[PDB]
Write a protein that binds this ligand. Structure first.
Ligand code: K
Ligand code: K
Ligand code: K
Ligand code: K
Ligand code: K
Ligand code: K
Ligand code: K
Ligand code: K
Ligand code: K
Ligand code: K
Ligand code: K
Ligand code: K
Ligand code: K
Ligand code: K
Ligand code: MG
Ligand code: MG
Ligand code: MG
Lengths: 50, 45, 101, 126, 126, 147, 186, 142
RNA sequence: ACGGGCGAGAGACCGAUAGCGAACAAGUACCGCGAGGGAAAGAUGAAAAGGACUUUGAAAAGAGAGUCAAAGAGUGCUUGAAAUUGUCGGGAGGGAAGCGGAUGGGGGCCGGCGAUGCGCCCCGGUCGGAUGUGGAACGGUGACGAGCCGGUCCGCCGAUCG
RNA sequence: CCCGUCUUGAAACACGGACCAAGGAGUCUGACAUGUGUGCGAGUCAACGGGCGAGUAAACCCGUAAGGCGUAAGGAAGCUG
RNA sequence: GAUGAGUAGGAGGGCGCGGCGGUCGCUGCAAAACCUUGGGCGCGAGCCUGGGCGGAGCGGCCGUCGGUGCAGAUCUUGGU
């Protein structure tokens, strides 16, 4: 259960993918090996099925 | 950006929420990393 | 004398990289927003309005446990607390006499 | 309930693999242990001696772990756990755990009768 | 949750303290609640059990019995009441020990010290 | 982690994997580096050439601070320039960036690699190699000596 | 009896799945298993085989080396099963289409600023299902410290294998067997 | 499943509070799933009630042969309280079967589990009838 | 800095052959001229309510009887394995016994040990019955818009079926 | 043919084993090395210490030109690179 | 489709014991332990269960940890 203030502070604490965090010096959130984990969308796409 | 609703209690007067979805909520979920770190740090106490 | 008597200078502690710690914390926070994972972890969230559950800042000023319970009921998180209270039990095994009852 | 299994159950061996010399020494239990002695006739597989188990005795996979009644065992501790077999009553049977009280056993038996789920030990604590 | 650093939550230490408590501490440990009427009158919840106090048992086989206390066996952690007794095989009568926490005080033997303690207890409650 | 130790898999196998004949005795070949010349000579010679003997002069009370001399290469000089200084230098051809490698903690500049193309550089250092100085001069910059 | 070695069974071991527990890597493995099965593409088979490999068998590729290998082929999608690291010795970064398991922050920033894109293998499947117009690259596998200690023993002739030493200096394995003036050389 | 169901399955197939395992990890291992939105209570990606956006839920209502048929709403995945579109059917088994078919298969919701949904509905209906009128046959003849 | 002294808080530690040698009148009993050596030993019951009384016996005790939820808890008293022993019952035995494999005699055990349902008709009893018309809430798709499509429940006119 | 063991060779006129219960033996630590998993990457490592904080031995945060390892090697050395 | 010997030795997958972080349960309508020509599952380590006794606690599952598995050692203590 998040309070509104804590939820708002989350962005400044953990930063994002693009910009860095204010509370963690030089930290950037990690990126996954898969951009889209929806396997069905990729497997049943027009490109693969063609 | 997705928006998160803020629940309002009876006492409060304004139902104004609309908090943008923080980037950390879309971070990769890695059970292996979580289990490894948890098991290693629980030893520290 | 026991074989290889235990010694205090056993490596009790671990030094995990801060980046890996932060990775784990971010992963846990991201998982907390998935209703399927929250249910799979054993939490009763069938009555929660939406996840992530964000409540008004007025809750921070509550002083009485009765008011806290009322706030939990209002936000729909009270069934989980009730389950936790009902699960109260004595620890099986020798741990109950090791100050973990 | 009509069991789904159709193939006959075939057992390659129905005798236990008893540990050698467990008949001779009381301190030596019956639970199987493979001899490692350099001269052991059992290890060397001398004819007329104690037989050693091996994968060749493996049961047919289709009939493996199937009880004589034609179903498979599943231990249930309460009526809530009983409902898991609602869609598998033709392949799985329920056995009530040994520590369940008679009061809960009655409810489990009633629910299983409602659900057409076979109980192997429905007469226990009656 | 305990926060005072000079109090222990250790089960061993708590049990040792309770079972090695001297007589003065045992007197406080052997407290009993007041009846409803006395509670309303004095604004006090519980009191240490005294010799000449009227007590009604509320638990055990003597749940309905009542009478005057005749002995406070602190060494045995019990109290004895007037007519709460039993017959031996010999046939002689012996009092039955009752724990003060399992009884209710219906009438207190009042003196200067008892009145002062009652006033002190009521003052904090207000 | 005890449960993953291989001795657990060897429970009930008598010799614990150390053999019936050879066995596992206390110190069958001596302690530590014993026999370096006599019965471990083959090992020492084939894996540790140069182990025995002494070479060179001694240096009583040798302090490393007076030999401290970090080095950087001209291929790494550009990385020291901030981005704003870099694009200012790219825009303006009438001036050259002035890098004091001492402030970044380098005493000597070595001439490995190449510099950015058609870029003059003024490098100040305590020492420099002949090749590095030649490369800087060819690039059109200059070298300054400091201490 | 039959005169066969080990009853005719194989004695070689190769990876058939990733040893890692990364769920995203598992999903990629499923994707490329399907691609290999239903397309029979050599590129897809190579990608699937490399997805199983250990860390040391997926060495990183430097940005400067990537640029050098992509020179003259900037229109093709460069694909590496591994990490791509930044190089401070590379000055000019062209626009490149790059697919890798992971990018360092500096390398990703430099590629995006230069005007390229950093792609994952799911995006690579969407773009080139059969690996068409791709440049498949591998990092330097044998360029690591541990490899220098492999090979012929340091003490045998013609051997340049690095020895194992706790410290470097005149007193550390330099006297006998390394000089003509102390016994023998090599 | 606010994140893809494939990822959710990759996470929860190893362990979850609804997983029931018995008889060890050898040949004797038996596995089941307890989540109410699993038609066959099977621990598989197909039937998983946790790793699928579209899920079918069929159970018995409190009283009067009422069967609860619920479907997970595709867009309200982040709203557990309103995540299930519920329908309580009190009519004949024929009407219940028609409704289940219409809500599961005819709209291409989850055609792959139409048979499972119909079988679950039949089992629930039989269980309700037996609970009302007591057991009357052993159902042992083939 | 701190395995001594006084006083405190904790533990992923041991649980009476473990843990200090010592959970107990333990550095005790006991041994040695001496320096020294050094054990074993915890658990009735909620409460003694700790077994009155009769009878046999020299007595210890036995047989009755009484207390207790319980003596199948009776003061070396929660529970009570194995080795080993007595009694009864079954069985076998020309200088070992035991054991592997296959049947048989005898015994013991097993009713999910082994079913009685299903389909089509007639009679009777209950519960519901459109693609029509209104209401309640809601969903699939689309773009958590429009449009299209759709199920559940309730109220009526017909239909007269399941 | 009686197991265990040493042995070229054991049923051995080879050694241990009268019987039962409980206890009973590749451990912890330091320096390395290969392999594998994980994070970051020309960097990496905050737990010497400091700021705090489950009213707290945890968790969280902090690297100024700190330090270790790596980022350059060859010489006994001057020294060159 | 082919194939199946294994001492020393290596490795994989599993069984079992006691804690810790979680999770799901059982128990005075009787837990643990122990007993039993009751029954069954697994090639096996073992496991599930009927009946008895006992009279207060215990188990499954996912991770993780260890003073974690005995027939021998003229092994130790106790008992016979
Ligand atoms: K035996
Ligand atoms: K074999
Ligand atoms: K070995
Ligand atoms: K050997
Ligand atoms: K010298
Ligand atoms: K002792
Ligand atoms: K008793
Ligand atoms: K021997
Ligand atoms: K002998
Ligand atoms: K550094
Ligand atoms: K020289
Ligand atoms: K548990
Ligand atoms: K049994
Ligand atoms: K465990
Ligand atoms: Mg016996
Ligand atoms: Mg420095
Ligand atoms: Mg231990």
């Amino acid at each position: 259960v998040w309070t509104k203030s804590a939820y708002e502070k989350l962005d400044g604490i953990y930063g994002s993918f693009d910009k860095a965090s204010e509370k963690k010096k030089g930290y950037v959130l990690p990126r996954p090996k898969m951009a889209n984990a929806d396997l069905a969308r990729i497997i049943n796409s027009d490109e693969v099925q063609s | 950006i997705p928006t998160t609703t803020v629940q309002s209690f009876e006492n409060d007067m304004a139902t104004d929420g609309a908090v943008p979805l923080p980037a950390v909520m879309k971070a990769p979920i890695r059970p292996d990393v979580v289990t490894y770190v948890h098991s290693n740090i629980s030893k520290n106490a | 004398r026991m074989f290889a008597p235990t010694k205090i200078w056993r490596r009790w502690h671990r030094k995990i990289p801060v980046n890996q710690k932060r990775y784990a914390v971010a992963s846990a926070i991201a998982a907390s927003a998935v209703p399927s994972l929250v249910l799979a972890r054993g939490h009763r969230i069938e009555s929660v309005p939406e996840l992530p559950l964000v409540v008004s800042d007025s809750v921070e000023s509550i002083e009485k446990t009765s008011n806290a319970i009322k706030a939990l009921k209002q936000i729909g998180a009270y069934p989980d607390a009730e389950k936790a209270k009902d699960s109260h039990a004595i620890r099986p095994g020798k741990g109950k006499m090791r100050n973990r009852r | 309930a009509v069991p789904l299994l159709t193939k006959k159950v075939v057992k390659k061996r129905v005798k236990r693999f008893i540990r050698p010399q467990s008949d001779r020494r009381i301190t030596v239990k019956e639970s199987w242990r493979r001899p490692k002695g350099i001269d052991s006739r059992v290890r060397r597989k001398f004819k007329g001696c104690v037989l050693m188990p091996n994968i060749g005795y493996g049961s047919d996979k289709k009939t493996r772990h199937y009880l004589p009644n034609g179903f498979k065992k599943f231990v249930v501790h309460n009526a809530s756990e009983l409902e898991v077999l609602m869609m598998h009553n033709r392949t799985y049977c329920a056995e009530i755990a040994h520590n369940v009280s008679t009061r809960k056993r009655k409810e489990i038996v009633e629910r299983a009768a409602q659900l057409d789920v076979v109980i192997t030990n429905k007469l226990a604590r009656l | 949750m305990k926060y005072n650093p000079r109090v222990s939550s250790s089960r061993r230490k708590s049990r040792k303290a309770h079972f090695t408590a001297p007589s003065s501490v045992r007197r406080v440990l052997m407290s009993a609640p007041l009846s409803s009427d006395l509670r309303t009158k004095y604004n006090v919840r519980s009191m240490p059990v005294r010799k000449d106090d009227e007590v009604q048992v509320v638990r055990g086989t003597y749940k309905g019995r009542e009478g005057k206390v005749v002995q406070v066996y602190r060494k045995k952690w019990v109290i004895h009441i007037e007519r709460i007794t039993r017959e031996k095989v010999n046939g002689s009568t012996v009092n039955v020990g009752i724990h003060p926490s399992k009884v209710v005080v219906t009438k207190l033997r009042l003196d200067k010290d008892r009145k002062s303690l009652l006033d002190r207890k009521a003052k904090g409650r207000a | 982690t005890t449960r993953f130790k291989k001795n657990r898999k060897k429970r009930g196998h008598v010799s614990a994997g150390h053999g019936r004949v050879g066995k596992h005795r206390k110190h069958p070949g001596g302690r530590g580096n014993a026999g370096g010349m006599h019965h471990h000579r083959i090992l020492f010679d084939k894996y540790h050439p140069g182990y025995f003997g002494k070479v060179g002069m001694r240096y009583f009370h040798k302090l490393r601070n007076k030999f401290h001399c970090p080095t950087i290469n001209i291929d790494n000089l550009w990385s020291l320039v901030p981005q704003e200084v870099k694009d200012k230098a790219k825009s303006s051809n009438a001036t050259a960036p002035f890098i004091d490698v001492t402030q970044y903690g380098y005493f000597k500049v070595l001439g490995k690699g190449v510099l950015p193309q058609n870029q003059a550089v003024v490098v100040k250092a305590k020492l420099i190699s002949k090749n590095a100085e030649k490369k800087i001069k060819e690039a059109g910059g200059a070298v300054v000596l400091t201490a | 009896g039959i005169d066969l070695k080990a009853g005719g069974k194989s004695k070689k071991t190769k990876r058939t799945a990733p040893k890692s527990d990364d769920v995203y890597l598992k999903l990629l493995v499923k994707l490329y298993r399907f691609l290999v099965r239903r397309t029979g593409s050599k590129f897809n088979a190579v990608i699937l085989k490399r997805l199983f490999m250990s860390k040391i068998n997926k060495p990183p590729l430097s940005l400067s080396r990537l640029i050098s290998y992509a020179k003259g082929k900037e229109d093709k999608v460069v694909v590496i099963v591994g990490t791509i690291t930044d190089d401070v010795r590379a000055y000019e970064v062209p626009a490149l289409k790059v697919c890798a398991l992971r990018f360092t922050k500096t390398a990703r920033a430099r590629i995006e600023k230069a005007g390229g894109e950093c792609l994952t293998f799911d995006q690579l499947a969407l773009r080139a299902p059969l690996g068409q117009n791709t440049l498949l690259l591998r990092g330097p596998k044998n360029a690591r410290e541990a490899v220098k200690h492999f090979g012929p023993a340091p003490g045998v002739p013609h051997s340049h294998t690095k020895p194992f030493v706790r410290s470097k200096g005149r007193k550390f394995e330099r006297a006998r067997g390394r000089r003509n003036s102390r016994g023998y050389k090599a | 499943t606010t994140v893809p169901g494939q990822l959710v399955w990759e996470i929860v197939k190893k362990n979850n509070s609804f997983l029931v395992k018995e008889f060890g990890n050898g040949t004797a291992g038996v596995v089941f799933s307890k989540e109410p939105n699993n038609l066959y209570n099977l621990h598989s990606y197909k039937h998983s009630g946790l790793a699928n956006k579209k899920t079918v839920t069929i159970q018995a209502e409190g009283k009067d042969k009422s069967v609860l048929l619920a479907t997970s709403k595709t867009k309200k995945q982040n709203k557990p309280s309103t995540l299930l579109n519920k329908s309580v059917m009190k009519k004949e088994f024929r009407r219940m079967s028609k409704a289940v078919t219409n809500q599961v298969a005819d709209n291409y919701y989850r055609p792959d589990l139409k048979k499972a949904a119909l079988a679950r509905l039949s089992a629930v209906n039989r269980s309700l009838k037996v609970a009302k009128s007591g057991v009357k046959k052993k159902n042992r003849q083939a």
